[PDB]
Write a protein that binds this DNA or RNA. Structure first.
Ligand SMILES: O=P(O)(O)O[C@H]1[C@H](OP(=O)(O)O)[C@@H](OP(=O)(O)O)[C@H](OP(=O)(O)O)[C@@H](OP(=O)(O)O)[C@H]1OP(=O)(O)O
Lengths: 13, 512, 494
DNA sequence: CGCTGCCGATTCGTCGACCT
DNA sequence: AGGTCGACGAATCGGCAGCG
């Protein structure tokens, strides 16, 4: 839970 | 971190067709791509975009044979995005009437990657696929595509016109093949690389956040003369600012070089006698006195600092330092020097000892031998993973003021009634921005304003885009979604109502 | 611009005590405030006069009164001349050149003082008087002097001139009820400073009394669309900065007027702001906009504070600093009743441990900002100086764009023995912190340099940089703890 | 591995405008 | 009006990265 899967990828970042 | 990324477009009839309640999948593809290119062009990054179409009435691509790779057109090669390309997408493109194979189009995109990126450099590759999956396709090549994607490090994102959760049998079969290939690259994380166009618009309706790489500042933290620790510091919070300024130009030619600024000099006295720059000297106020002082003498006599420092004056209770005194325009986080086991142990010891005693450190800071020295506090911060000191600047004695405000509590005129205090007590509950007892006895923030992007930049870029795309029309008004994001939740807005009526009825207010 | 007058006692007791004489204490305080006015570049007019004087000198030739300085801007020559009476040697010099401890009438003193305000040019806005003595009821032997002085003081107070008493330490304690209470310019709630025994406290008391407030702006704070209150904004701390140089003519030592034209490169004609457009190049294109358009695109809301809601104080992270805070207080002069809401709000949110949150707009045509109002309760020290004024502290909160992302790093944990030595080290380095403890080395040297030139002394004093660490004493206070810590934590190789 | 130009960041010192 | 405060453009420096 300390690092979160929500981080955007590719097109979104 | 250059990414080469390819937009791969179904231009057939099925996504051209629209369900009348919504814009066509072709239109949604236009909009989401439009947001994407707007982001990239108004971003400072130099990443390049290539656009390819599949299902075209024509057939022209690097792999294309007489019968193989049919109905595929390389609309746009890999160059930096620009307004010409933007207008091409906006109006030039039109729906097609044929079908092609997206796993041919992505190996056409592999050929584009191979032949157009070899003269360049890229850390990453991404393919963006748009279709309804209504066409028959083959899976014979599935091994050599997955191998190609693995060996060349190509990432995929598949965009579906429908929510993941009426699709045809071919459609659901393609869905599962999308699952299987994206599992074959990325497993369950692969299965999360699917997005609906509604949430896509929700996610990238906003222009992109500004960012920078804060330069590391290496230094020796000194306790007394003998104890020293190697550290590195980074700016963490700053009043961030767009670097590109306005430029001034002639109203007729639109050129910069047609205009010039001139500085006049004349005596303060009557009739404003003109003065040559040569016979002007530099001087200073000292009360009613005026002292002449040349720049050379001023520089030679100016205070000289020793240079870089981070030295500790002593320690005190945290409660000595009320945060209202915090001065300066920056916040530094200080970590240990890069790759020094002993240094990390030492600084860990310091953060621990300080937090245990509930104390803070006072430090003297100097950026370099040219800058002015500062006095500031440092204090411990603890997280999962890393520990660090925070640092902030403190005031010099010359920069305080005091004002002797009248005490309100002892006043006879302004003391509120108990009824008035009850109306206030109702109001302060109704406007609560936080939820308690989330089963962890923790606050949930209903309005976490640290996550909202600065609206001044949103307004600036929106107006710039509107002018560029349409020179004749005047500036558009502000966007309603922008307003909604700047207002608090509607639940709080609705709950505010009755207490506001109560407080208006209770308190008498009147103007001078 | 205002004007202020200082009154100083020549009575024998002023020259008596480890503590400084209250006379020399007064002189040092006056020096410090003159320097303070110079460093601010402020335009007020100061004056110094003595009473009970053995020799005498003043405009009306009344006895036992000595004007040392008329009502004027601070000057280098003046502060040098004032410093001539410092310490015991200056005290002796003063008592030799003037004498001391003669009779006087304070009615005449106050009449002379009114003459000094009467003699002023160009109409200064506020006129004030400040009294130094430790003598309570000086005319307890003479009710005719007391009653004529009381009468005169009433006339001056009808004249609107303020007057106040910095009563210094007295053997047997000073009493306000005996005299001066009926004479000073009062104020509404009285609570008043104790007698002063230390230069720091005396300086604090005069400095807190001396400056009038200057409201930074007159916003409206909106609880909703309908309910709105008038408030004043004040900065309370503001960054000191080196004064800019002024261009000077070589021959006449007269300041010069600089102007700034703009004209066409070819034609050379002066260019109106209408004769030019504003542009940026983005992508690969040039975009043209107007000056009015640029101003318009910045417009959000109107000047004023809008309440968003209330948030419990624990959620405001400490390290989310951005810019120096501001102070907010009710401004009854525009909207009657405002203070009653303001105080009710302060009371209840203090009791509930909660901040308000607002959208902020300082002035016309500025993008908004999110600020949080934190309640702040009044607190007086043991001298009854107001340390923290009552109100809301206005804290700025950062947007998402203000955070910079940090590089990754591995956690490494100290041992309890390491922490133990370090606690011992930290306690051995403990001291007490106060905001007034440190001066700005750059300003402090700059003004020394200017004075050496202004006085033709030419070789300036090198000011000690008190921000530097007390290294040798700190080493001595540590003893062998540093080498113990080093041998313990550091490997045998650096 | 060294040279070179590029770039960005950063700190600082003037200038121009709003508000009392 | 005049001064004060904040924002904004220009100057200067040091470090990073691209090309050989
Ligand atoms: O949860 P908090 O204690 O309030 O701290 C949060 C949270 O920290 P974590 O990553 O450790 O969970 C953020 O992540 P999210 O809330 O978005 O999930 C993180 O985000 P950033 O690093 O990108 O700023 C940031 O950590 P920190 O307090 O050290 O700055 C801070 O975000 P907020 O300040 O906005 O609450």
């Amino acid at each position: 839970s300390k690092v979160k899967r929500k981080k955007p990828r590719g097109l979104f970042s | 971190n250059k990414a080469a990324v390819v937009l791969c477009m179904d231009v057939g009839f099925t996504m051209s067709n629209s369900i009348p309640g919504i814009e066509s999948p072709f239109e949604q593809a236009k909009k989401v791509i439009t947001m994407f290119v707007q982001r990239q062009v108004f971003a400072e990054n130099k990443d390049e975009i290539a656009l390819v179409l599949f299902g075209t009435d024509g057939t022209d691509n690097p792999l294309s044979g007489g019968d193989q790779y049919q109905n595929i057109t390389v609309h746009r090669h890999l160059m930096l995005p620009d307004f010409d390309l933007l207008e091409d997408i906006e109006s030039k493109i039109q729906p097609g009437s044929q079908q092609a194979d997206f796993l041919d189009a992505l190996i056409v995109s592999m050929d584009v990657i191979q032949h157009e990126t070899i003269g360049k450099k890229f850390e990453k590759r991404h393919i963006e696929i748009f279709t309804d999956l209504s066409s028959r396709f083959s899976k014979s090549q599935l091994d050599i595509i997955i191998h190609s994607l693995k060996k060349c490090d190509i990432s995929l994102q598949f965009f579906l016109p429908f929510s993941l959760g009426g699709i045809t049998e071919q459609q659901k079969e393609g869905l599962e093949i999308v699952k299987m290939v994206m599992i074959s690259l990325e497993g369950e994380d692969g299965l999360d690389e699917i997005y609906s166009f509604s949430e896509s618009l929700r996610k990238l309706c906003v222009f992109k956040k500004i960012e920078r790489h804060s330069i590391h500042w290496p230094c020796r933290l000194t306790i007394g003369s003998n104890l020293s620790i190697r550290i590195a510091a980074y700016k963490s919070i700053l009043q961030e600012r767009v670097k590109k300024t306005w430029t001034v130009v002639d109203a007729k030619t639109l050129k910069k070089e047609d205009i010039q600024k001139e500085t006049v000099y004349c005596l303060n006295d009557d009739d404003e006698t003109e003065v040559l720059k040569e016979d002007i000297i530099q001087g200073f106020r000292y009360g009613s006195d005026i002292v002449p002082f040349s720049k050379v003498d001023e520089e030679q006599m100016k205070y000289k600092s020793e240079g870089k420092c981070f030295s500790v004056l002593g320690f005190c209770k945290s409660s000595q330092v009320q945060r209202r005194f915090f001065m300066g325009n920056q916040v530094l986080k200080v970590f240990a020097a890069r790759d020094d086991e002993a240094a990390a142990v030492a600084l860990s010891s310091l953060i621990h000892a300080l937090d245990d005693l509930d104390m803070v450190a006072i430090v003297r800071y100097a950026y370099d031998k040219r800058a002015n020295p500062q006095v500031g506090v440092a204090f411990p911060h603890i997280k999962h993973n890393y520990e660090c000191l925070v640092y902030v600047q403190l005031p010099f004695m010359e920069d305080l003021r005091q004002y002797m405000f009248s005490s309100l509590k002892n006043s006879k005129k302004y003391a509120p009634t108990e009824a008035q205090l009850n109306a206030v007590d109702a109001l302060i509950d109704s406007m609560s921005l936080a939820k308690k007892d989330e089963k962890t006895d923790t606050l949930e923030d209903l309005f976490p304003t640290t996550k909202i992007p600065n609206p001044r930049f949103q307004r600036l870029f929106q107006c710039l885009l509107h002018r560029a795309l349409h020179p004749r029309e005047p500036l558009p008004p502000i966007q309603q979604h922008i307003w909604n994001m700047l207002n608090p939740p509607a639940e709080v807005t609705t709950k505010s109502q009755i207490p506001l009526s109560k407080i208006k009825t209770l308190f008498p207010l009147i103007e001078a | 611009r205002d004007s202020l007058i200082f009154l100083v006692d020549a009575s024998k007791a002023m020259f008596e005590s480890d503590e400084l004489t209250p006379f020399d204490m007064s002189i040092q305080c006056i020096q410090s405030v003159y320097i303070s006015k110079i460093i601010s570049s402020d335009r007020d007019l100061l004056a110094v006069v003595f009473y009970g004087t053995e020799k005498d000198k003043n405009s009306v030739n009344f006895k036992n009164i000595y004007v040392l300085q008329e009502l004027d801007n601070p000057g280098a020559k003046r502060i040098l001349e004032l410093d001539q009476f410092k310490g015991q040697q200056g005290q002796k010099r003063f008592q030799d050149m003037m004498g001391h401890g003669s009779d006087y009438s304070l009615s005449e003193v106050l009449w002379v003082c009114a003459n000094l305000f009467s003699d002023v040019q160009f109409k200064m806005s506020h006129k004030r008087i400040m009294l130094f003595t430790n003598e309570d009821n000086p005319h307890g032997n003479d009710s005719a002097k007391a009653s004529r002085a009381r009468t005169k003081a009433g006339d001056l107070r009808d004249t609107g001139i303020f007057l106040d008493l910095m009563h210094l330490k007295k053997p047997g304690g000073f009493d306000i009820s005996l005299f001066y209470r009926d004479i000073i310019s009062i104020a509404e709630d009285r609570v008043h400073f104790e007698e002063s025994s230390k230069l720091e406290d005396l300086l604090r008391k005069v400095r807190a009394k001396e400056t009038r407030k200057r409201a930074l702006s007159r916003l409206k704070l909106k609880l909703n669309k309908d309910i709105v209150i008038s408030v004043g904004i004040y900065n309370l701390v503001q960054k000191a900065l080196k004064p800019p140089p002024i261009k000077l003519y070589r021959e006449t030592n007269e300041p010069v007027k600089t102007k700034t034209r703009t004209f066409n490169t070819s034609t050379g004609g002066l260019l109106l702001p209408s004769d030019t457009k504003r542009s940026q190049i983005y992508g690969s294109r040039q975009i043209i906009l107007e000056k009015e358009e640029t101003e318009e695109l910045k417009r959000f809301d109107d000047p004023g504070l809008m309440l968003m809601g209330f948030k419990p104080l624990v959620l405001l992270k400490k390290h989310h600093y951005l810019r120096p805070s501001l102070f907010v207080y009710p401004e009854e002069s525009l909207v009657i009743g405002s203070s009653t809401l303001f105080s009710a709000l302060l009371i209840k949110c203090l009791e509930k441990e909660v901040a308000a949150l607002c959208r902020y707009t300082p002035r016309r045509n500025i993008p908004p900002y999110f600020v949080a109002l934190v309640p702040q309760e009044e607190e007086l020290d043991d001298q009854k100086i107001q340390v923290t004024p009552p109100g809301f502290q206005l804290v700025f909160l950062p947007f998402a764009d203000d955070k910079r992302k940090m590089p990754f790093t591995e956690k490494i944990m100290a041992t309890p023995e390491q922490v133990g030595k370090m606690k011992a080290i930290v306690e051995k380095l403990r001291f007490t912190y106060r905001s007034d403890s440190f001066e700005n080395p750059v300003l402090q040297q700059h003004f020394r340099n200017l004075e050496a030139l202004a006085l033709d002394l030419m070789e300036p004093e090198q000011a000690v940089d008190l921000t530097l660490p007390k290294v040798e004493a700190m080493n001595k206070r540590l003893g062998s703890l540093v080498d113990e810590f080093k041998e313990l934590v550091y490997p045998p190789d650096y």
